[PDB]
UniProtKB/Swiss-Prot annotation:
It is an enzyme of class 3 (hydrolase). Disulfide bonds join 7-137, 25-41, 109-210, 116-183, 148-162, 173-197. GO terms for molecular function: endopeptidase activity; metal ion binding; serine-type endopeptidase activity; serpin family protein binding. This is Serine protease 1. It is found in: Secreted, Extracellular space. Subsequent cleavage after Lys-125 leads to alpha-trypsin. Further cleavage after Lys-170 yields pseudotrypsin. A cleavage may also occur after Arg-99. Not sulfated on tyrosine residue(s). Synthesized in the acinar cells of the pancreas. The gene is PRSS1. GO terms for biological process: digestion; proteolysis.
Length: 223
């Protein structure tokens, strides 16, 4: 996250770190046994890390659980990033408490102008690289579909939304992918793609979770 603030340890209890020997993407806990992330974050041998603040120090609230199965959306297109969503089932159920909790799925799609919270351990500079050890947060509004399409002509589908600031300076960045966009207590987006980070007229692009509720519930119910 560029231009954000330090969340504070365990203040975003549904935030997960996906680890394959190092942190590579964020995720969101949706129930005690399932995580939602970005399909572009798919790999085999994922370890889900819950209750993290500093990803380099065992502080005492972590739960490390291996994934038992991963399911990329049936229509994921890696060239266009359309349907950039995946489900990961944990080998065992996480223990839920104040610091490890699930985020609720939306019953309605959020509108342009709604303020949301975006979080992750990604790069913090738009120029060069500096990866934080502790969870970073950014409050950003959902942009109008019109704004979004004008920033990225021919690339936004109905399963994507833009969030951020057209003036630049504040955005998600590398390593934030798969992380949550929460608006009014519901998971509305997944950090998916962008052009650079925090550049003027190039806000981050997010997977629109409200379009996938049916797929998520059906999938959880049978696996
Ligand atoms: Ca830790």
């Amino acid at each position: 996250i560029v231009g954000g603030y330090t969340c504070g340890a365990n203040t975003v209890p549904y935030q997960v770190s996906l680890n394959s020997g190092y942190h590579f993407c964020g995720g969101s806990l949706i129930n005690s046994q399932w995580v939602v992330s970005a399909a572009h974050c798919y790999k085999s041998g994922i370890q889900v890390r819950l209750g993290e603040d500093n990803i380099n120090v065992v502080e005492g609230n972590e739960q490390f659980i291996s994934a038992s199965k991963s399911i990329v959306h049936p229509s994921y297109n890696s060239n266009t990033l359309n349907n950039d969503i995946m489900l990961i089932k944990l080998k065992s159920a996480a223990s839920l408490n104040s610091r490890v909790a699930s985020i609720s799925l939306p019953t309605s799609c959020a509108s342009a102008g709604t303020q949301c919270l975006i979080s992750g351990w990604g790069n913090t500079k738009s120029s060069g690289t500096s990866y934080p050890d502790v969870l970073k947060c950014l409050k950003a509004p959902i942009l109008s579909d019109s704004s979004c399409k004008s920033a990225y002509p021919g690339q936004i589908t109905s399963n994507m939304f833009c969030a951020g600031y057209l003036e630049g300076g504040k955005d998600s960045c590398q390593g934030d992918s798969g992380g949550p966009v929460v608006c009014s207590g519901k998971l509305q987006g997944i950090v998916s793609w962008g052009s650079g980070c925090a550049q003027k007229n190039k806000p981050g692009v997010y997977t629109k979770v409200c379009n996938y509720v049916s797929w998520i519930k059906q999938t959880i119910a049978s696996n």
